[PDB]
Amino acid sequence: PLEAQAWALLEAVYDPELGLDVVNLGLIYDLVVEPPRAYVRMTLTTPGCPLHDSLGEAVRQALSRLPGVEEVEVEVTFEPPWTLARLSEKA
Protein backbone atom coordinates (compact mmCIF):
# COMPACT_ATOMS: atom_id res chain seq x y z
CA PRO A 1 0.00 0.00 0.00
CA LEU A 2 2.81 2.39 0.90
CA GLU A 3 4.71 1.35 -2.24
CA ALA A 4 1.90 2.69 -4.42
CA GLN A 5 1.61 5.82 -2.32
CA ALA A 6 5.39 6.24 -2.58
CA TRP A 7 5.28 6.14 -6.37
CA ALA A 8 2.55 8.78 -6.49
CA LEU A 9 4.64 11.06 -4.26
CA LEU A 10 7.72 10.70 -6.49
CA GLU A 11 5.58 11.31 -9.57
CA ALA A 12 5.06 14.81 -8.17
CA VAL A 13 8.80 15.46 -7.79
CA TYR A 14 9.92 17.37 -10.89
CA ASP A 15 13.36 17.77 -12.45
CA PRO A 16 13.88 21.42 -13.52
CA GLU A 17 16.20 20.75 -16.47
CA LEU A 18 13.75 18.41 -18.22
CA GLY A 19 10.41 19.69 -16.92
CA LEU A 20 9.31 16.13 -16.07
CA ASP A 21 8.92 14.13 -12.85
CA VAL A 22 11.70 11.82 -11.64
CA VAL A 23 9.55 8.72 -12.17
CA ASN A 24 8.57 9.30 -15.81
CA LEU A 25 12.14 10.44 -16.46
CA GLY A 26 13.36 7.03 -15.32
CA LEU A 27 15.65 8.39 -12.59
CA ILE A 28 14.40 6.04 -9.88
CA TYR A 29 16.43 2.82 -9.96
CA ASP A 30 15.16 1.09 -6.83
CA LEU A 31 12.56 1.84 -4.17
CA VAL A 32 11.91 -0.09 -0.98
CA VAL A 33 9.48 1.11 1.67
CA GLU A 34 9.54 -0.96 4.86
CA PRO A 35 8.56 1.11 7.92
CA PRO A 36 10.26 2.70 9.69
CA ARG A 37 12.60 2.82 6.68
CA ALA A 38 12.44 3.86 3.06
CA TYR A 39 15.32 3.37 0.63
CA VAL A 40 15.67 4.78 -2.84
CA ARG A 41 18.52 4.50 -5.34
CA MET A 42 18.35 7.10 -8.09
CA THR A 43 20.49 8.96 -10.58
CA LEU A 44 20.73 12.44 -12.14
CA THR A 45 20.37 13.42 -15.82
CA THR A 46 23.95 14.67 -16.16
CA PRO A 47 27.28 13.29 -14.88
CA GLY A 48 28.99 14.74 -11.82
CA CYS A 49 28.00 15.57 -8.25
CA PRO A 50 26.27 18.94 -7.93
CA LEU A 51 27.21 21.44 -5.21
CA HIS A 52 23.69 20.96 -3.77
CA ASP A 53 21.83 17.74 -4.65
CA SER A 54 18.44 19.48 -4.56
CA LEU A 55 16.70 16.78 -6.64
CA GLY A 56 17.83 14.06 -4.25
CA GLU A 57 16.67 16.29 -1.38
CA ALA A 58 13.24 16.69 -3.02
CA VAL A 59 12.93 12.93 -3.42
CA ARG A 60 13.86 12.42 0.25
CA GLN A 61 11.24 15.00 1.32
CA ALA A 62 8.55 13.37 -0.78
CA LEU A 63 9.16 9.94 0.74
CA SER A 64 9.22 11.36 4.26
CA ARG A 65 5.55 12.27 3.66
CA LEU A 66 4.77 8.55 4.00
CA PRO A 67 3.34 7.55 7.40
CA GLY A 68 5.67 5.64 9.69
CA VAL A 69 8.80 6.35 7.65
CA GLU A 70 11.29 7.82 10.13
CA GLU A 71 14.42 7.17 8.06
CA VAL A 72 14.77 7.81 4.34
CA GLU A 73 18.02 6.75 2.67
CA VAL A 74 18.51 8.31 -0.78
CA GLU A 75 21.51 6.91 -2.67
CA VAL A 76 22.55 8.78 -5.80
CA THR A 77 24.50 6.69 -8.28
CA PHE A 78 25.67 6.86 -11.90
CA GLU A 79 25.61 3.07 -12.31
CA PRO A 80 24.06 2.50 -14.70
CA PRO A 81 24.47 5.93 -16.33
CA TRP A 82 21.17 7.56 -17.35
CA THR A 83 20.05 8.40 -20.92
CA LEU A 84 16.74 9.48 -22.48
CA ALA A 85 16.09 5.85 -23.39
CA ARG A 86 14.86 5.53 -19.78
CA LEU A 87 11.89 7.84 -20.33
CA SER A 88 8.48 6.22 -19.86
CA GLU A 89 5.98 6.17 -22.72
CA LYS A 90 4.01 8.94 -21.01
CA ALA A 91 7.12 11.12 -20.87
Next chain:
Amino acid sequence: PLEAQAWALLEAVYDPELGLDVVNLGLIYDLVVEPPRAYVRMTLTTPGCPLHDSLGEAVRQALSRLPGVEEVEVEVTFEPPWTLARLSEKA
Protein backbone atom coordinates in the same frame (compact mmCIF):
# COMPACT_ATOMS: atom_id res chain seq x y z
CA PRO B 1 8.62 24.76 -27.94
CA LEU B 2 12.31 24.81 -28.82
CA GLU B 3 12.61 21.27 -27.46
CA ALA B 4 10.40 19.89 -30.23
CA GLN B 5 12.16 22.03 -32.82
CA ALA B 6 15.51 20.74 -31.51
CA TRP B 7 14.46 17.12 -32.02
CA ALA B 8 13.34 17.83 -35.58
CA LEU B 9 16.71 19.43 -36.35
CA LEU B 10 18.61 16.43 -34.92
CA GLU B 11 16.36 14.06 -36.87
CA ALA B 12 17.91 15.59 -39.99
CA VAL B 13 21.49 14.95 -38.83
CA TYR B 14 22.66 11.70 -40.48
CA ASP B 15 25.35 9.20 -39.51
CA PRO B 16 27.31 8.00 -42.61
CA GLU B 17 28.20 4.49 -41.40
CA LEU B 18 24.58 3.52 -40.68
CA GLY B 19 22.71 5.78 -43.09
CA LEU B 20 20.26 6.83 -40.36
CA ASP B 21 19.76 10.02 -38.35
CA VAL B 22 21.31 10.36 -34.89
CA VAL B 23 17.90 10.40 -33.19
CA ASN B 24 16.46 7.19 -34.63
CA LEU B 25 19.89 5.62 -34.16
CA GLY B 26 19.61 6.32 -30.42
CA LEU B 27 22.84 8.33 -30.20
CA ILE B 28 21.30 11.25 -28.30
CA TYR B 29 21.50 10.57 -24.55
CA ASP B 30 20.37 13.91 -23.15
CA LEU B 31 19.10 17.16 -24.67
CA VAL B 32 18.45 20.39 -22.78
CA VAL B 33 17.56 23.64 -24.54
CA GLU B 34 17.43 26.68 -22.24
CA PRO B 35 18.30 29.91 -24.10
CA PRO B 36 20.93 31.17 -24.48
CA ARG B 37 22.26 27.64 -23.89
CA ALA B 38 21.75 24.21 -25.45
CA TYR B 39 23.35 21.06 -24.06
CA VAL B 40 23.49 17.65 -25.65
CA ARG B 41 25.17 14.47 -24.46
CA MET B 42 25.61 11.88 -27.19
CA THR B 43 27.69 8.89 -28.23
CA LEU B 44 29.14 7.36 -31.41
CA THR B 45 28.43 3.93 -32.95
CA THR B 46 31.98 2.64 -32.49
CA PRO B 47 34.43 2.94 -29.59
CA GLY B 48 37.27 5.44 -29.67
CA CYS B 49 37.70 9.14 -30.34
CA PRO B 50 37.91 9.97 -34.05
CA LEU B 51 40.53 12.35 -35.45
CA HIS B 52 37.66 14.68 -36.46
CA ASP B 53 34.38 14.33 -34.54
CA SER B 54 32.32 15.23 -37.63
CA LEU B 55 29.07 13.83 -36.27
CA GLY B 56 29.41 15.79 -33.03
CA GLU B 57 30.11 18.90 -35.14
CA ALA B 58 27.00 18.26 -37.27
CA VAL B 59 24.87 17.95 -34.13
CA ARG B 60 26.28 21.22 -32.72
CA GLN B 61 25.55 23.00 -36.02
CA ALA B 62 22.00 21.68 -36.11
CA LEU B 63 21.24 22.96 -32.61
CA SER B 64 22.81 26.33 -33.35
CA ARG B 65 19.99 26.78 -35.89
CA LEU B 66 17.66 27.28 -32.90
CA PRO B 67 16.69 30.90 -32.16
CA GLY B 68 18.41 32.47 -29.17
CA VAL B 69 20.92 29.67 -28.62
CA GLU B 70 24.31 31.43 -28.46
CA GLU B 71 26.15 28.53 -26.81
CA VAL B 72 25.88 24.84 -27.68
CA GLU B 73 27.70 22.29 -25.52
CA VAL B 74 28.04 18.86 -27.15
CA GLU B 75 29.47 16.19 -24.86
CA VAL B 76 30.49 12.93 -26.48
CA THR B 77 30.55 9.98 -24.11
CA PHE B 78 30.78 6.19 -24.23
CA GLU B 79 28.82 5.78 -20.99
CA PRO B 80 26.67 3.91 -21.50
CA PRO B 81 28.24 2.24 -24.56
CA TRP B 82 25.97 2.21 -27.63
CA THR B 83 24.58 -0.91 -29.37
CA LEU B 84 21.92 -1.47 -32.05
CA ALA B 85 19.43 -2.20 -29.27
CA ARG B 86 19.10 1.60 -29.06
CA LEU B 87 17.51 1.92 -32.51
CA SER B 88 13.97 3.31 -32.54
CA GLU B 89 11.11 1.26 -33.98
CA LYS B 90 11.14 3.48 -37.07
CA ALA B 91 14.83 2.73 -37.61
